[PDB]
Amino acid sequence: STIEEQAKTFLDKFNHEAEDLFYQSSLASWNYNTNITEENVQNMNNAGDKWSAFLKEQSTLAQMYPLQEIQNLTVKLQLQALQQNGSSVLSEDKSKRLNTILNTMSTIYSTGLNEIMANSLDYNERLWAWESWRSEVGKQLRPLYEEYVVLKNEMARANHYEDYGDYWRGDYEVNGVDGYDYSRGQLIEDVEHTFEEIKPLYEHLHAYVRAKLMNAYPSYISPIGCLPAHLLGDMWGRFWTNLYSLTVPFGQKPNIDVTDAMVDQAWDAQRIFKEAEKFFVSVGLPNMTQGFWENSMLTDPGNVQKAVCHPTAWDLGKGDFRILMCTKVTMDDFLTAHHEMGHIQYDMAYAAQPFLLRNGANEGFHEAVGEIMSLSAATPKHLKSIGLLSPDFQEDNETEINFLLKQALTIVGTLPFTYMLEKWRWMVFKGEIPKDQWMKKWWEMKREIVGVVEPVPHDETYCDPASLFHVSNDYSFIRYYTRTLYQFQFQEALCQAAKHEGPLHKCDISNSTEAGQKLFNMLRLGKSEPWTLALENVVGAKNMNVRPLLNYFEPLFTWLKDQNKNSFVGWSTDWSPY
Amino acid sequence: CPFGEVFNATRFASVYAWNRKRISNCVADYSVLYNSTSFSTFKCYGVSPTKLNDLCFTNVYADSFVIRGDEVRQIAPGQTGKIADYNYKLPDDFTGCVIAWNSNNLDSKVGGNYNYLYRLFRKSNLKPFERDISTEIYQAGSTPCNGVEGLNCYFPLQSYGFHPTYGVGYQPYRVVVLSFELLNAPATVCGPK
Ligand SMILES: *[C@@H]1O[C@H](CO)[C@@H](O)[C@H](O)[C@H]1NC(C)=O
Ligand SMILES: *[C@@H]1O[C@H](CO)[C@@H](O)[C@H](O)[C@H]1NC(C)=O
Ligand SMILES: *[C@@H]1O[C@H](CO)[C@@H](O)[C@H](O)[C@H]1NC(C)=O
Ligand SMILES: *[C@@H]1O[C@H](CO)[C@@H](O)[C@H](O)[C@H]1NC(C)=O
Ligand SMILES: *[C@@H]1O[C@H](CO)[C@@H](O)[C@H](O)[C@H]1NC(C)=O
Ligand SMILES: *[C@@H]1O[C@H](CO)[C@@H](O)[C@H](O)[C@H]1NC(C)=O
Ligand SMILES: *[C@@H]1O[C@H](CO)[C@@H](O)[C@H](O)[C@H]1NC(C)=O
Ligand SMILES: [Zn+2]
């Protein structure tokens, strides 16, 4: 009767009580989201507070077991997940102040321009919106962030962590397993190596976009300089998709869009979801349950009932899976349905694992699994052998170039942005950048990594990074980088099992049970095994890699290299509009 | 032969306090039970079910309880798990049959049916066909529990939660096990030869 058996009994009882309370809370939340009434809000609050109190008491109990006398890895992982103190290490006043700061930042951000920045071609109007938003948000969020940083560093140091950035990197850490270890500081090296491999493609894409924007906005862009921040199609420049109207290679050929075929064949939400189910069954994965069809809502209730329209996939425990989405008959809803059903399938994979181990291997696998399904379902061959597109649609290389550029403007154009933001936050938390040198160094990293210049000078009173939703509301942001690699990391691994015989962007993994089994072997694991082993079970490598992305985007790379002969590739940091 | 009070009964007991009913001095029509397409599982181990209508026994017993759906596999000789260890244990050399059918519409309420209980902790595995209804508080480690549960002291009987929205593996299942006893005393249960 050592610590091992006591820990096992404790985990059994915790699993039972936690599963009960979690199902109750999830049912309350679903009832509130389907129908919006005050009573539903009250029930949601009651269930949530009960669940939170139970978790706090259980963590306090679980801190007893020293964790050094445990030889089994599963028990050690569950207890380590349960023993995390969190923000309880602080005093009462400090915790109250931190909560107040977080709440006031959230409220001040929410109650403050997404059409003046997406559908406008006026330079002055966009500059006005940019400067007004930053001046009337960051200049108010700055001191709150200044106190937030120090309080969160105190919390992290009290938990035997160097800083709060290390607290964030702790997700990817694997220890105790020979050959699959992963330190917290190796993530920086991996990210930097990957970005150094990425850079030239971004340089060529940047040159192409700059050349097109010179035509779009005369007498405002230098052929050797940078791109101003307010011309990027978004309020922040996170994505470059809205520029597609100005940077289309061949605008005389319309892109593929099969909404009209859906309307002419009398399609509906039910047909969309049965098509997705048939796709997943053809791959090899198990079919869906009757509860999914009965208990889930796939259309808009109407006007008597108000519901949140955000498409979500719910796993409520006790074998309960459902989807909340207001499905219109279009092509975007088709891909969104595929994405969310992929989420549901991933959730169903690890239903046999213990409660604390029912999640992805790390914070970047759910989205990757959904995205690869959507990419495989959006291919022209699939649309031909689904019945929408005509069964004589000989493609033309111009259409593939258009599709690749559309994908690039959303995928490649965001990696430098996320890398810069995460690195800036890491250095701020480390204390490398002093307070008075924050913003200036920020813009430095904008001119050396992503290549974006400030239209108007910014003093130290401003706080531009705080203007973004993730920074203000305390969310990790590296999740959007690693996923973007894992996605392609998976795809080329599944195309080879599917015996693909062409370019990677024309890959469809339907009617291939080997790819399904290869995916399902990783899916069933959950969080039980290190993410290195889970990645190796699919791709044969234990580390994050970039080459599949270049293999996917090679045709665009060679076309851009051929096109950019008479233009300049690269940028200089000396140029400034002001 | 009283199979109506065994199968079509209003109330079924918890798994820890499973009911035994002794069936004697009747003529048994097992065809009327086999030809029913309402049973999720009907598995006979010692003898073939088709010949259940042409044999004579002495002291057939009917054991009834309610469990989950994925725990039905544990009702078989040589199986392991919480139900097969602490709640209901069958001998390795077991002659008889097991019948199990879904009861979601009867035994699931909207807010939750917490009447059904199962034993979670015990010191030792049960011998076959042994029942305990005790409620002493389990002693996890080495410290006097002294009655009321404390730091390491767990109440051994937990409650099944049944909602009508649960999955098939978590929906209520009613289970009846027929055990055939064959010794040299005069037969009391026979089929219509
Ligand atoms: C909210 O809508 C659900 C159906 O979506 C309905 O059953 C429920 O009665 C509604 N709430 C109230 C308070 O009527
Ligand atoms: C850890 O405990 C589980 C629970 O049964 C067991 O299956 C596994 O073999 C154990 N790991 C060991 C002994 O290394
Ligand atoms: C949590 O806090 C308690 C005291 O408040 C401390 O003994 C324990 O070591 C802490 N846990 C961790 C993981 O730091
Ligand atoms: C679910 O999938 C199974 C396995 O392919 C199939 O036999 C069954 O017909 C499907 N159920 C449907 C499509 O309702
Ligand atoms: C997969 O196989 C089925 C079998 O008939 C076929 O109808 C279908 O066109 C194939 N391809 C896809 C993408 O389903
Ligand atoms: C597309 O193919 C045609 C003929 O194969 C060729 O003339 C044209 O240059 C190609 N366009 C590209 C590669 O963008
Ligand atoms: C239980 O009732 C149904 C109909 O109510 C009947 O068909 C069935 O035979 C009954 N069960 C037994 C064991 O007779
Ligand atoms: Zn996703």
Numbering used by the authors:
A (entry chain A): 19 to 130, 148 to 613
B (entry chain B): 336 to 528
What does the paper say about this structure?
Animal coronaviruses (CoVs) CX1 (formerly named BtSY2) and BANAL-20-52 are phylogenetically closely related to severe acute respiratory syndrome coronavirus 2 (SARS-CoV-2), and CX1 is the first observed animal betaCoV carrying naturally occurring Y501 in its receptor-binding domain (RBD) of the spike (S) protein, a residue related to human adaptation and broader host range. The S protein sequences of both CX1 and BANAL-20-52 are closely related to SARS-CoV-2 PT S protein and share high AA identity (97.96% and 98.43%, respectively). Additionally, both S proteins lack the PRRA insertion on site 681, resulting in the absence of furin-cleavage site (FCS) facilitating S1 subunit dissociation. Determination and analysis of cryo-EM structures of their S proteins and RBD/hACE2 complexes revealed that Y501 shows a synergetic effect with R498 and inter-replaceability with H498 for hACE2 binding.
Interestingly, when preparing the sample of CX1 S/hACE2 and BANAL-20-52 S/hACE2 complexes, only part of the S1 subunit complexed with hACE2 was observed, indicating an unexpected dissociation. The binding interface between CX1-RBD and hACE2 was clearly observed and demonstrated a similar pattern to SARS-CoV-2-RBD. In Patch 1, N487 of CX1-RBD forms an H-bond with Q24 of hACE2, whereas K417 of CX1-RBD forms a salt bridge with D30 of hACE2. Two conformations of hACE2 H34 were observed, forming an H-bond with Y453 and S494 of CX1-RBD, respectively. In Patch 2, Y449, T500, and G502 of CX1-RBD form an H-bond with Q42, D355, and K353 of hACE2, respectively. Compared with PT-RBD, CX1-RBD contains three distinct sites on its ACE2-interacting residues, namely F486L, Q498H, and N501Y, and BANAL-20-52 carries only Q498H. The F486 forms a hydrophobic patch with F28, L79, M82, and Y83 of hACE2, whereas the shorter side chain of L486 only interacts with M82 and L79. Thus, when the RBD carries H498 and Y501 at the same time, these interactions are saturated and can only be formed with either H498 or Y501, but not with both simultaneously. Thus, the CX1 (H498/Y501), CX1-H498Q (Q498/Y501), and CX1-Y501N (H498/N501) demonstrated comparable affinities with hACE2. The SPR results show that CX1-RBD binds to hACE2 with a comparable affinity to SARS-CoV-2 PT-RBD with the dissociation constant (KD) of 21.67 nM vs 18.16 nM, whereas BANAL-20-52-RBD demonstrates 4.3-fold higher affinity than the PT (4.19 nM vs 18.16 nM).
